[PDB]
Structure 1
């Protein structure tokens, strides 16, 4: 395959990306949920699409299995976007990374135990606040961890705050703002710029 391979994040991000694509040359022929297909052709014959876990997008781009991709800034910070170019802030799928604990519960007199998917971000954030933390790695349902004692605080993406409030939790500290970003493989940027520039300019025009 000589065209561009585009790595898209599966869930929340995919919904707000589709309008940006259609404004460019690109739109999917099938639908991701209905079809059990991994590689998707588009309206543009020079663009191919991969529908991936949000966590896997940076990996595919960095190793050049995809030429470019749309990925959450929370995922890029946690992954370490060392070997990719972060070309555009798409300003979609906006949210915040925050700390959250139980409502009105006091901080214990010890090293805080942090339950999170975002272990590098947690460690980094609490290091910047001069706090030493014991980090516990989890993959899903961060809300649960403080309720059964698994950690004192969590770190997770928060938009409205309803999931936290519905489980008796409150937000504590703002870590940073998050949005989906356009990432491009270092080598693809040099070798396939002719294919990329018109798509990059249409995404730029779409905001």
Structure 2
């Protein structure tokens, strides 16, 4: 089970093992210590495409966060770590969300400029098109949306939206640009998602690793 070779071959077919997809950046940082408790460590600095681990039947992918649910649901990864925001916006129907890893905590919120409430149908700028619609629907409301990928705080300042929906941590980026957080839509944290087929047929390998990650978190 142990492996110390950094150039251990983990290429091609890996149906016998687990392909673990990690979000790059902050989620990676907070995830790697947890994984260590399950005897899964990298043998190289990523910043220095598929990576082997200290476990011979586990290999790691480092993806953009958006791709993690895609890879997991399609079975290109057996399991992955994604923000609750990303998961729920993508659609969570084709994966299992087994663990709250309780890392990268933030809040999905509405936000705006003492702006007067506008008269007609509100326009929301967001990358979270679906979550925006569900939230407003829960209030008995419906909105126009413009999908943006970044610099969400700009949208109200140049008239692309009346309000935004975005993740808020410190909320300093907002205060900086004359915006304020308004309503909390939900609490967000990183989650361990598993491909359904993988979960059903790879219990022997998954069950102990999942249990160890659980212990590590609590």
TM-score class, shorter? over 0.9
Task: Give the aligned partner of residue 107 of structure 1.
Answer: 117
Alignment root-mean-square deviation, CA: 0.9
Unaligned runs of 5+ in 1: none
3-state DSSP of counterpart to 1:173: strand
Q: Separation in 2 of the partners of 1:90 and 1:150?
A: 35
How many matched pairs?
A: 203
Q: CA deviation at 1:32?
A: 2.0
Q: CA deviation at 1:126?
A: 0.6
Report runs of 4+ in structure 1 exceeding 3 Å deviation. none
Q: Separation in 2 of the partners of 1:33 and 1:145?
A: 32
Task: Give the aligned partner of residue 52 of structure 1.
Answer: 63
Matched, 1:149 2:154: no
Task: Give the aligned partner of residue 44 of structure 2.
Answer: 30
1:6-45 alignment to 2 at 5 Å?
Answer: 6-34=20-48, 38-45=49-56
Q: CA deviation at 1:110?
A: 1.1
Q: CA deviation at 1:12?
A: 2.1
Matched, 1:61 2:61: no
Please report the TM-score for the alignment, with normalisation by the length of structure 1: 0.96
Please report the TM-score for the alignment, with normalisation by the length of structure 2: 0.91
